[PDB]
Design a protein around this ligand. Structure first.
Ligand SMILES: CNc1ccccc1S(C)(=O)=O
Length: 119
């Protein structure tokens, strides 16, 4: 019932994601010189360094907010891809499956801890 435990759990999951070769295209903001039309397609850029820095700054109040930003990395990739079999899109699908498999318990434990706090 530790209400604060999600933060270190999210730090550890971000570390695993940065160790994954599939996270390479998503570790830093998309290069606007290489993809000059990116901001025409994508309203809210997001990347894993921005997520990690937001967490370390103490600017997430809950793991749901961190989830929303990570899911935005994956939806931006889906929105930009010219095809459903593109290399970078396919890397984002595998990384998304890995992230969802691991964030499930972090979200459940946090929500359970908050319910216990208000019992
Ligand atoms: C070729 N680049 C690509 C393809 C599909 C999805 C995302 C990207 S991006 C601009 O985020 O690197």
């Amino acid at each position: 019932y530790d209400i604060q435990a999600w933060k270190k759990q999210c730090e550890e999951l971000l570390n695993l994601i940065f160790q994954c070769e599939d996270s390479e295209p998503f570790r830093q903001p998309v290069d606007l010189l290489e993809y000059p039309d990116y901001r025409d397609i994508i309203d809210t850029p997001m990347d894993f360094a921005t997520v990690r820095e937001t967490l370390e700054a103490g600017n997430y109040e809950s793991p749901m907010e961190l989830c929303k930003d990570v899911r935005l990395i994956f939806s931006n990739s889906k929105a930009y891809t010219p095809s459903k079999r593109s290399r970078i899109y396919s890397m984002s699908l595998r990384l998304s499956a890995f992230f969802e498999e691991h964030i499930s318990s972090v979200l459940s434990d946090y929500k359970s801890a908050l319910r216990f706090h208000k019992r």
